[PDB]
Write a protein that binds this ligand. Structure first.
Ligand code: HEA
Ligand code: HEA
Ligand SMILES: CCCCCCCCCCCCCCCC(=O)OC[C@H](COP(=O)([O-])OCC[N+](C)(C)C)OC(=O)CCCCCCCCCCCCCCC
Ligand SMILES: CCCCCCCCCCCCCCCC(=O)OC[C@H](COP(=O)([O-])OCC[N+](C)(C)C)OC(=O)CCCCCCCCCCCCCCC
Ligand SMILES: CCCCCCCCCCCCCCCCCCCC(=O)O[C@H](COC(=O)CCCCCCCCCCCCCC)COP(=O)(O)OCCN
Ligand SMILES: CCCCCCCCCCCCCCCCCCCC(=O)O[C@H](COC(=O)CCCCCCCCCCCCCC)COP(=O)(O)OCCN
Ligand SMILES: CCCCCCCCCCCCCCCC(=O)OC[C@H](COP(=O)(O)OCCN)OC(=O)CCCCCCCCCCCCCCC
Ligand SMILES: [Ca+2]
Ligand SMILES: [Cu+2]
Ligand SMILES: [Zn+2]
Lengths: 269, 110, 55, 534, 98, 36, 119
């Protein structure tokens, strides 16, 4: 390589992004959501049509942020090896923060469980609450989630191997096996005897599993954008960072479910 | 002008063989996980889905039996049961996001 | 697939990255219309809330 | 232009924006302190007619504006964003686009806070927003809801900033900078980011629990329902005690760098310094409930928390002595940053001795929720973190901006703030030992003595702040003329004893960081070809 | 050790090829806690004559006067160095009156 | 070493006692001048 | 008209790096669908070349005025950090060698002359 040619390229492996309007558009969408939600809670508007609008703009702006990331990684190709390590490291530091949010929810459960309050019964769960039975329906969700970790594993290695019919089929089963988890969890919520308003027991129960429930819906969306990118020849055999972070996300989210299955279901009845 | 020095030629053939070694390890280990999926995961789901299907229908007939007779009225609520410190803003005053009028009632004993 | 012919378009465009794709005009124009309503309507209710009139 | 400031991706422009937001919020928050002092000058409601509200609201606004809108954006977002890439040698940050949203969500929080203050209720709950008083029955307006939303915005800003600094430090260093060989300021920023990452989510969980309990009917802390208002104290203070160390650890790096440049001798035992800095951060996670001594804990856990909190003094003391050992032999240059550092060494040790006095659970039953604690934490905050902020500004501003600042007019400001703050915050310990409680607008007559003295001293510090604003104006305007005449000092290191004046003028900066070798102001693209070390 | 110290700066000064190196070595010799031996100072004087800088030779005793810490030990260094100083021509600061 | 150190050490302890008495003992002035 | 480089020496900036797309029914490889600076790095790995330099500067010598340590840069300046002939002998002193100037390292005495290759 000539000295003249090398000077027509970056001298460092890090990616310099052009100025973008999305960091502030999302910032303005977060104020409208924060300012409209604070009003509808006490009136001052009349109906919940502005909250829906704020959520739609918040989601749509975030889609256009991710729309730019895939363009500069697949068409402009600015993700060198050094850049790819930072993205993986940044996601690993992001899932640790996600775990510690759950760690604050387990602390809230153990506080009222080990020494149950006196306004409740002397026992736990409180008197007159029909808790979810661990063996009938939640056990179906446990087997489903474990099988998701087994079918995304050979979908990952089939992509490395080089055949696309097994890689594409592994995700398709993975997506529909996660949707079944969401629909089955939907069935239990609408058939439960107790509500979020049922004292302290309903608060901790629906905050742990509800936060996981909201995380599973975001997992299916992440799985859905990997099926579009694989079908349209975006993900290559040796460069898929949007797929590696999805496999770590589903494996970490199975460990959290197993912990939520031992203390909220078994140990709490 | 050469910029970089002479090619190593030793990092090559150690980088170009690890790629072949990596895809070979993913080739057979993928076949191992397919065997686990079909012979462990699939039977496990089939033996727990048929069980859940039968128990679910047993619950379903119980739920529709509740509507048939109010009879002796719904069980009374403890002091912590229904909390109405501030009414919900979405619709009527007292209904949660997921409400099943069959099993959730909130009758007021005044 | 189309990635090769999409690569040649995104590179050598001299336009903002969100305007390079030929189909981008369909998303951007309706977005700024809805976006303006989203970040201006809650700001109109602020003086009404300061006075205390509940709608 | 709109593109340069609204679509910012350059880290230095984001640092300038962080600085600019910090001064405005700093002036806004230091006027509420003036009104508080004017209200506490004499017994009886003198200026605020009888409103006990609009007094607690002003206190909350003052505390939030001083902590979450001055120190956080200046030490972490202002200095950390501008200096960490330059000393490491990185051209910019790892995630340049979320670095902008880490800033632009801060002005939204200001709007949420102001509109919270303007609603008829207000948020008179303190900066520690305890559930039962800030519940829906006692604070029935949308005010504390808007106050909570501001805390979420600050938390998300801090979290996204913290994730940026960990990845930037770990894999964007130059060709010779092994993790073992780092400047101490980068080490402080690294440890601070790790504390933030592990502490913020628990605060977010507790705050969202409070929001859902007020509006979504969850017996999270409601007594009628089995809730416990003390669980909130654990959840909040688990982020609370580690927090008092996010605001001082980057203050340690500044002092470490200042005292070894105007004293021409390197730091005594650097590896022990980084060990002690990491130990304070690690062990501060094991002492959070000393803020909860009188809440009714067990006798044995009080002994544990008493024993674990005193260990804090072992590494901390190591930092105090190692600062006094790097100035023992060298030649001392008494400039404004050195005067701030020397004042810090004395005032922070005065604060820390009172702190160790507060650490004993058996004695804290006489010193808790009094002006004794206020006097304590105003030494490590208003004299420990503010002074290092002034020292950092006077240390790096001529290099950053390219404009000098008329030395003799800055030493006057230093003396004024010194003898003004000492007047405000020293008599407080006298008011606290007689049992004067906190968070009251009006007090029994016998306390009128030292309160008048403290109120007189607030005007001196306010005058010093006004003089500092004038110094800023005289630096930006005709600041290029300050280095032509004899108003300012140009070189921060005088030549050695046997170094002639014509040899000092070929090696002007003998520094141990890349910061002072760059052009003034630094270029937009600082590092094309990477720098090499060792 | 002191003898090792003296014998190793006796060699450093003999190799100083410019006026930047002479002022660098003498700033190292007087930066140590020990006051240098009179044998060390004599070699430093020779170096200044070699690079043709009168003012650094004058600063040698000025450095020593603050370093020696004793009013009689400065005279002790003064007496043994009379021959070399007078032969070279270095004036003391007090005699020079600058 | 006794002769040299004496000329510098002992005067400073007297200056030492003055400044520290000012930074710490200033509120005694306000109380006496006119506690009134 | 223009063809993919296939080698680090045929590189003529970006257009050559672009590659042939994956055929239908196959999983794409990196040699098929890389496009930019990530591809230039990939081309270097196939040979024995590291396109990005991370080697520190040598401590083998001291470096005098008549035998400076040569530092090669693509600009008119660079930043070097000296610690001594045995690496770590003294405290680091940051220097800025430029064109028409040499750093001297007031503590140790090393001399550096910039070698301006580029443009
Ligand atoms: C930057 C801010 C900051 C810093 C650095 C500290 C540092 C310390 N703090 Fe605290 N603190 C606060 C900010 C800070 N604090 C705030 C804001 C509150 C009140 C919050 C509220 O309730 O609203 C508070 C309240 C607070 C309490 C609760 C009091 C109460 O509410 O009743 C306690 C309890 O022990 C405490 C102790 C300490 C200790 C032991 C240290 C140690 O780190 C200090 C160690 C220092 C030294 C040891 C001196 C220096 C060392 C030497 C001179 C070596 C020689 C030393 C020995 C031989 C021991 N402080
Ligand atoms: C950083 C934090 C910080 C700072 C700087 C201050 C500064 C001051 N504070 Fe305090 N204060 C708190 C944090 C702070 N405070 C907290 C957390 C509480 C508890 C609230 C509660 O109980 O809920 C509190 C409570 C508090 C009380 C007790 C209220 C009560 O309990 O009811 C009082 C009483 O006088 C007081 C007065 C002052 C005064 C006169 C100043 C200043 O006048 C002192 C001098 C300092 C300055 C004038 C600032 C100078 C610097 C700048 C303006 C920034 C610009 C400079 C650079 C960028 C280098 N504030
Ligand atoms: C971002 C964080 C998440 C969003 C937080 C704010 C928004 C929360 C809205 C909650 C609205 C609500 O009422 O949800 C109710 C549901 C289930 O409540 P339910 O309808 O009573 O369920 C039982 C149904 N029966 C038995 C009657 C048939 O309960 C749920 O499904 C709750 C799910 C949400 C749980 C949030 C936990 C937050 C923890 C801290 C997060 C910090 C960030
Ligand atoms: C140190 C720098 C200065 C620190 C601040 C000093 C403030 C002095 C002060 O406030 O003194 C006021 C008293 C007034 O007299 P009083 O006895 O308090 O009676 C009440 C009168 N009011 C307060 C209603 C006006 O009058 C006095 O007692 C005046 C005493 C002044 C003593 C000299 C200054 C302090 C020492 C230096
Ligand atoms: C709120 C929490 C939001 C969390 C966001 C997490 C983002 C994780 C991925 C970060 C970027 C990874 C990355 O660069 O992957 C790119 C695609 O990812 C993407 O563009 C992924 C976008 C889809 C994420 C959807 C998540 C739900 C969002 C809900 C609203 C918020 C392309 O990288 P590559 O290496 O695969 O390209 C190979 C080309 N040859
Ligand atoms: C909470 C938000 C999600 C945080 C976790 C993801 C952060 C790590 C991955 C990452 O660096 O990608 C980011 C994109 O995700 C995002 O931050 C986009 C989602 C934003 C959600 C806003 C609500 C920032 O990537 P970058 O665009 O800053 O830098 C691109 C340099 N090639
Ligand atoms: C303290 C008590 C209160 C003092 C109040 C002073 C009011 C203003 C006077 C300004 C006079 C002036 O300008 O002083 C100028 C003097 C002399 O400077 P020079 O020798 O260069 O001569 C100038 C003419 N060519 O320098 C100084 O100040 C520097 C010394 C400062 C020492 C530290 C100060 C900070 C406090 C540290 C904590 C206390 C340490 C000791 C603890 C016991
Ligand atoms: Ca009053
Ligand atoms: Cu604490
Ligand atoms: Zn050197």
């Amino acid at each position: 390589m000539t000295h003249l040619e090398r000077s027509r390229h970056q001298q460092h492996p890090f990616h310099m992004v052009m100025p973008s309007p999305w960091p502030i558009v999302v910032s303005f969408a977060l104020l409208s959501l924060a300012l409209s939600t604070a009003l509808t809670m006490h009136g001052y508007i009349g109906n919940m049509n502005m909250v829906y609008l704020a959520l739609f703009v918040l989601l749509t702006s975030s889609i256009l942020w991710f729309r730019d990331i895939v363009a500069e990684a697949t068409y402009l190709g600015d993700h060198t090896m050094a850049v790819r390590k930072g993205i993986n490291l940044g996601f690993l530091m992001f899932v640790l923060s996600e775990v510690l949010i759950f760690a604050g929810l387990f602390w809230a459960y153990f506080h009222s469980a080990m020494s149950p309050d006196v306004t409740l019964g002397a026992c736990w769960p409180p008197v007159g609450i029909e808790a979810v039975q661990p063996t009938e329906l939640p056990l179906l969700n446990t087997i489903i989630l474990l099988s998701s970790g087994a079918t995304v594993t050979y979908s990952h290695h089939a992509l490395i191997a080089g055949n696309r019919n097994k890689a594409l089929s592994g995700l398709l089963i993975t997506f529909w096996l996660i949707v079944i988890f969401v629909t089955c969890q939907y069935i239990e919520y609408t058939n439960a005897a107790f509500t979020i308003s049922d004292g302290v027991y309903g608060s901790v129960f629906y905050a742990g599993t509800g936060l996981h429930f909201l995380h599973m819906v975001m997992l299916a969306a992440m799985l859905g954008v990997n099926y579009w990118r694989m079908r349209n020849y975006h993900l290559t055999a040796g460069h898929h960072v949007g797929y590696e972070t999805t496999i770590i996300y589903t494996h970490v989210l199975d460990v959290i479910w197993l912990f939520l299955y031992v203390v909220f279901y078994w140990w709490g009845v | 002008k050469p910029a970089f020095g002479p090619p190593d030629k030793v990092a090559a053939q150690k980088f170009k063989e690890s790629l072949m070694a990596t895809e070979k390890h993913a080739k057979d280990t993928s076949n191992m996980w397919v065997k686990i999926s079909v012979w462990v995961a699939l039977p496990a789901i089939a033996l727990t889905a048929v069980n859940t299907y039968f128990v679910e229908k047993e619950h379903a007939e119980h739920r529709e039996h509740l509507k048939h007779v109010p009879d002796s009225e719904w069980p009374r609520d403890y002091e912590f049961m229904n909390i109405r410190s501030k009414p919900f803003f979405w619709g009527d005053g007292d209904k949660t996001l997921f409400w099943n009028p069959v099993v959730n009632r909130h009758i007021e004993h005044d | 697939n189309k990635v090769i012919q999409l690569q040649k378009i995104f590179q050598s465009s001299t336009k903002p990255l969100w305007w390079r794709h030929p189909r981008s005009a369909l998303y951007l124009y309706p977005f700024y219309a809805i976006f303006a309503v989203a970040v201006v309507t809650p700001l109109l209710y602020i003086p009404n809330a300061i006075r205390g009139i509940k709608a | 232009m709109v593109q340069r400031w609204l679509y910012s991706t350059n880290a230095k422009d984001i640092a300038v924006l962080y600085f600019m937001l910090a001064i405005f919020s700093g002036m806004a928050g230091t006027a509420m302190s003036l009104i508080i002092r004017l209200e506490l000058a004499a017994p009886g409601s003198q200026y605020l007619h009888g409103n006990s509200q609009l007094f607690n609201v002003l206190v909350v606004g003052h505390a939030v504006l001083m902590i979450f809108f001055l120190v956080m954006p200046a030490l972490i977002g202002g200095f950390g964003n501008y200096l960490l890439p330059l000393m490491i040698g990185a051209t910019d940050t790892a995630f340049p686009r979320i670095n902008n949203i880490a800033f632009w969500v801060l002005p939204m929080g200001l709007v949420c806070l102001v509109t919270s203050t303007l609603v008829e209720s207000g948020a008179g709950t303190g900066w520690t927003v305890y559930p039962p008083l800030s519940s829906i029955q006692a604070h029935s307006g949308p005010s504390v809801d808007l106050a909570i939303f501001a805390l979420h915005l600050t938390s998300i800003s801090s979290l996204l900033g913290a994730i940026n600094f960990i990845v930037t430090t770990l894999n964007m260093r130059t060709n010779g900078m092994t993790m073992h060989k780092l400047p101490l300021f980068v080490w402080s920023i690294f440890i601070t980011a790790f504390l933030l990452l592990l502490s913020l989510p628990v605060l977010s969980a507790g705050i969202t629990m409070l929001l859902l309990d007020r509006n979504f009917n969850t017996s999270f802390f409601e007594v009628s329902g089995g809730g416990d208002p003390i669980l909130y104290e654990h959840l909040f203070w688990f982020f609370g005690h580690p927090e008092v160390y996010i605001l001082i650890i980057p203050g340690f790096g500044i002092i470490s760098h200042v005292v070894s440049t105007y004293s021409k001798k390197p730091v005594f035992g650097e590896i022990s310094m980084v060990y002690a800095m990491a130990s304070i951060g690690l062990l501060g996670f094991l002492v959070w409930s000393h803020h909860m001594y009188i809440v009714g804990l067990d006798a044995d856990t009080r002994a544990y928390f008493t024993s674990a909190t005193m260990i804090i003094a072992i590494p901390t003391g190591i930092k105090i002595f190692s600062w006094l050992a790097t100035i023992h032999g060298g030649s001392i240059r008494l400039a404004t940053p050195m005067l701030y550092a020397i004042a810090f060494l004395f005032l922070f040790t005065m604060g820390g001795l009172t702190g160790v006095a507060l650490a004993n659970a058996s004695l804290d039953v006489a010193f808790h929720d009094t002006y004794y604690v206020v006097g304590h934490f105003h030494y490590v905050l208003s004299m420990g973190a503010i002074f290092s902020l002034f020292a950092g500004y006077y240390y790096w501003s001529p290099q950053i901006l390219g404009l000098n600042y008329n030395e003799k007019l800055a030493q006057i400001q230093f003396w004024l703030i010194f003898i003004g703050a000492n007047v405000i915050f020293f008599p407080m310990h006298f008011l606290g030992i007689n049992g004067m409680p906190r968070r009251i607008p009006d007090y029994p007559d016998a306390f009128a003595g030292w309160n008048y003295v403290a109120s007189i001293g607030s005007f001196i510090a306010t005058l010093s702040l006004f003089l500092f604003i004038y110094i800023l104006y005289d630096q930006l305007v005709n600041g290029l003329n300050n280095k032509v005449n004899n108003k300012s000092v140009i070189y921060n290191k005088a030549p050695d004893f046997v170094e002639s004046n014509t040899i000092f003028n070929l090696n002007t900066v003998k520094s141990s960081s890349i910061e002072f070798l760059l052009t003034s102001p630094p270029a937009v693209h600082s590092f094309n070809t990477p720098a090499v070390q060792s | 050790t002191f003898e090792e110290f003296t014998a190793r700066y006796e060699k450093e000064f003999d190799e100083a090829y410019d006026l930047f190196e002479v002022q660098r070595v003498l700033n190292n010799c007087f930066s140590y806690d020990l006051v240098p031996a009179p044998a060390v100072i004599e070699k430093a004087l020779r170096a200044a004559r070699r690079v043709n800088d009168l003012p650094t030779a004058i600063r040698v005793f000025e450095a020593l006067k603050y370093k020696v810490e004793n009013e009689d030990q400065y005279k002790a260094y003064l007496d043994e160095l009379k021959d070399v100083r007078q032969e070279l021509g270095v004036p003391l600061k007090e005699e020079l009156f600058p | 070493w006794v002769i040299t150190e004496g000329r510098r050490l002992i005067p400073e302890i007297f200056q030492w006692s003055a400044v520290l008495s000012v930074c710490l003992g200033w509120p005694g002035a306000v109380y006496f001048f006119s506690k009134a | 008209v223009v063809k993919t480089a296939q080698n680090l020496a045929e590189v003529n900036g970006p257009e050559t790096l672009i590659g042939p797309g994956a055929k239908e029914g196959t999983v794409p490889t990196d040699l098929d669908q890389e496009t930019g600076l990530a591809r230039l790095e990939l081309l270097g790995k196939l040979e024995g070349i590291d396109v990005f330099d991370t080697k520190p500067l040598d401590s083998s010598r001291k470096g005098t005025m008549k035998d400076p340590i040569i530092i090669e840069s693509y600009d008119d300046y660079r930043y070097v950090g000296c610690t001594g002939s045995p690496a770590g002998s003294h405290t680091i002193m940051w220097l800025k060698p430029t064109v028409n100037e040499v750093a001297r390292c007031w503590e140790c005495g090393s001399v550096y002359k910039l070698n301006p290759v580029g443009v």
